[PDB]
Amino acid sequence: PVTINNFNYNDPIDNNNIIMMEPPFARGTGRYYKAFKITDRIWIIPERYTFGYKPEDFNKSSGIFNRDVCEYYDPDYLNTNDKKNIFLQTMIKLFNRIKSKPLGEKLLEMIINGIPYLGDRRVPLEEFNTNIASVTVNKLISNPGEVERKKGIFANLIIFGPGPVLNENETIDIGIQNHFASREGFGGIMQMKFCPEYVSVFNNVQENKGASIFNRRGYFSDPALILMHELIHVLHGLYGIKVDDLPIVPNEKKFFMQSTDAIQAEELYTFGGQDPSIITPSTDKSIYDKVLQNFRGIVDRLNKVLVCISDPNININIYKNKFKDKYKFVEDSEGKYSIDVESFDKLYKSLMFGFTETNIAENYKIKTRASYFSDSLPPVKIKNLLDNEIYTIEEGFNISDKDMEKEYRGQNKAINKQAYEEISKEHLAVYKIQMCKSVGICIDVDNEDLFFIADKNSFSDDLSKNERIEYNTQSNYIENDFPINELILDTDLISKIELPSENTESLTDFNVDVPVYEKQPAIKKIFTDENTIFQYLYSQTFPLDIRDISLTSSFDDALLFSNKVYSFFSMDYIKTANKVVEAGLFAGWVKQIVNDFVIEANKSNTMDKIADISLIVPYIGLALNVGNETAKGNFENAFEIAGASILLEFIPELLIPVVGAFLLESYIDNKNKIIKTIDNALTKRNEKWSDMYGLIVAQWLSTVNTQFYTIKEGMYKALNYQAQALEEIIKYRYNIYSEKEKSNINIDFNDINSKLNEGINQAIDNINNFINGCSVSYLMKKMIPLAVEKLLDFDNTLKKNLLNYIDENKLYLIGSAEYEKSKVNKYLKTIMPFDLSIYTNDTILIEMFNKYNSEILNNIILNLRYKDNNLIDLSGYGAKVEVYDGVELNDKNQFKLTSSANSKIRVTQNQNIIFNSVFLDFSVSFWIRIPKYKNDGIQNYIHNEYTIINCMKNNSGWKISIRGNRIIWTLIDINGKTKSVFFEYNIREDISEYINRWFFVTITNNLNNAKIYINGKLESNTDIKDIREVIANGEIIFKLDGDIDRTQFIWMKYFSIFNTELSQSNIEERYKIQSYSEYLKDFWGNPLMYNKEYYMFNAGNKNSYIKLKKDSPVGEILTRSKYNQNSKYINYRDLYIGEKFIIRRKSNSQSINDDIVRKEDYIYLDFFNLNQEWRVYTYKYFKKEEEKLFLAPISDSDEFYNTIQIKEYDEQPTYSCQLLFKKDEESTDEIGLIGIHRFYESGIVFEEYKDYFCISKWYLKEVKRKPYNLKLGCNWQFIPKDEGWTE
Ligand SMILES: [Ca+2]
Ligand SMILES: [Ca+2]
Ligand SMILES: [Zn+2]
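The line above is the sequence of Botulinum neurotoxin type B; the predicted structure tokens follow.
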């Protein structure tokens, strides 16, 4: 158990637990400090830390010590005894809060027992030397009047009050002759500058801190966690493992980059959480090795130590025993000390990954920042930590009895205001970057708001070095984690060995290196005329001395006029916001513009499913103009084209080393070692893959995700500014009225602000998801594949290497040299799948990942789309696409393959996308229109199979071919074994849904089946378990190839590939998404047009058509003629028959050229009678359920309705549409729908039934039934002449 001593600042000196100490950095001169022993080996000195600081530095000046801290100054802190005593009592409570839990008590116990080795690098191995400034510190025994008697003592930790900057807590170790004992295994006296009342403030952007913009957002820190954070550094320092290694260093070549001090891996380990992942596994191991090496040096000293000259009273055994336990060395029955790998490993992990701020915060239920790389904010002052009404040893601020326990409400700035006070900005110092334009207006930006981007130098190149594979060689992995529960329950973790006496001989060699600090300018100017994020956000603010503003979509005016504020919301929203109204209409207006705000903010949930993009926040580009001029042009389009990478302010130069070559150890005649060797090189190869991935994740987190975090923050600020601006306008407008008018104006600013705030929170969530999705997208498509390339390159080089090896030893491999020849190939075969959770256990990151991977659209490895008269791949994987001259394309994303040699498309697929699941698992989807066979060429049509899409590599692959009325899918495994599945549509039907008609195809493949889907429905299946490997990433060729007729062609649209098997659900869903359009379709499936001749088809009367009756102004219904010629293979009904209709537009007399017919349009339905154009009418006064339509010349009789509204009642994809007659555009009185009705006719000679072109009210209720009755006689389709259909 740990004992926390008690005392008052005025208690008298006793030279034991209360002394006059001579601090290490005083170099043995200067005055002493009243020091209090709070526990063994730990001292508290309630005075300001002055070593290395000028006295005036304690005042706020025009400078700053650290560029990334809102520094608070106060030279009066601790300038009295009562203050010093308060400081003491406060420290006592914090230490008490700390040991209040097992985890904290152990940290304290580990620290107390982690006494520094007696000596350092300069000391001889056979000796213990206490006479160095990292081991002994002196205390003055003498009477106040002389330094006559000084005594030396051993100490582990000395804690002072803060230096010039109150909120800049720090742990310092002792350097002597340019070396640090605490960094080389010995350990040494640790010091700390600490301030308990002025704690840091932080807030999680992805989360809602009270979810109120008009209120204080954020959380303040539990000073006990802050202290435990520093105590972790102390623990590292004491055990001598606070080693230096390759640091994370920020790139600063660009003005938008954040400037900050280099960050050592130890710093990130201390914080824990995601941060350790920024330290590559490479460096992780480098550090592990350095520490191990340091321990080897100590264990060797223990086996050599003989005497201690410095203190003749030191008991060598007592210390050898203590140090043995400290470092967990093992001693044989003979007394020989040696390093035990298990014990070391566990001890190392415990100190670097067990004791972390993250793990501790979690155990003590204390809330803290998300990552070391989180924007710092202005600190707040806790009112009184000594008041149990506000802060307790057991719960800190989150006191349950006060209901401040849930959701860390006790640390919530908006909820626990009685706990703290805001700080006088007048005393805060903040490093700023002043961006001036070469002219000239200037903008100040906090160095915090810039983009932190790790320079390439931050990462290890170790992967590029050679490796020696020997029968004994083994893998190397360091899990950046540690089971906190076992750490807490570890029985032998805490020493049970006697702590030696702290009294020793006085220190006489005061040699030590003292740091010297100095401020630097708090403002750094830079010149740039760039109008990126910083400017855009700026243009959205206004001066405090200005209260009358106006919104404007002009970024340039906003900058030029203080009364002008930029808004990235809609033109309409902007106009309404600047409107001015009568007091009596003000309330209406307030409700209107506020609701409008929420609408605009909510556009953050926009979907773009047709472009295979689920979520997109359209206004991000206008709001920040971040990355590549994202404020110009249409953002959504730009995004569809280049994706996530267009949002980045800078594209990072990744470090992807060529994996060092392997060197295997040969063992002549030894059939065992030779094999081991081989096996090992294999395993090692896998370690190389993992290490490479970690290297990637590390760079992604510190150069990419960091930028995206900056963007999410920028959006939060942008949205906040918009609300503030609107609020400003509202207040201004309202205050223009008289008190009398105001009294009668019903307005509740609390509901307004609540409305805004809510709309913002919704938008923030959408924005956060969109951005995380982008980040993960960039990782997986722009980073990972490049690592895969070099990793596969490595594999190959290793492949021959291994073979050539087995080769040379085949002798000593005799009758087994074979069983391993394959063993090698079959290993370097199946590669390693990337798994984020392997390099981190951060909940947020893991979830981002799983979310991404659970979105089918991300399984798209090829998506050919039309753009600026050209087909490009928008999968994001960069496939190269060559579209040759003979290929015709349109902006309808339709492309045509002809019989010409140059009607061809070549796709060079990305070779670095994992596509070899090792069982075949992928899908292909596309729309197609296959022309009808030539009646005189039917034999060749059914006989000649021709390839349309071929993807082969080494006589293995897949292909789509066609033989007449049959489309075929074929696979060839590496052995030449083939399998196919096909879909054949019937060519003997009166009317076909497929011939010359656009239809959706989808082919799925999995270890067991090959399935063909047509329009969302499954049509064919083939068992493919037999098929072996199938190379599928070879070149893809789109071209007709086979004995085809010269007139043969094929139309294709939306060709795409997924590296997985699509479910019936996904397929049905893709069918619907791609079928959608505002416009109606024609019989063939192309968009319906105005001023285009069409024959009419009836879905309810397939073999019926319309003809003008000879003696009557009506349309009679005749039976379609059918295929005349003979042949046992074909049969169909003629389509180019009946009257030739033409759809005419209604409003806008902008001539009658042409255009697209959209659902709900009003039209005239005409047809050609000889040289004239007639029209279809309805007698307004028919009284029966149905009426025969009136067909006559164009005129405007008041007895006939002539206006028709085209409709779509079917909610599922269809080429049918319906025609409605309504009183007039306005009226909601539906006269009826156009269809066909049966009539009984009995003349003097003939007696029969005869169908007519009618209008009918019966259809009105029928079209509402579900499912939609496709057979309804009111379902029509328009057939225009098409080269794909001849009769
Ligand atoms: Ca790591
Ligand atoms: Ca302005
Ligand atoms: Zn730290």
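Note on the example: The first helix runs from residue 81 to 99. Residues 32 and 773 are 59 Å apart (CA to CA).
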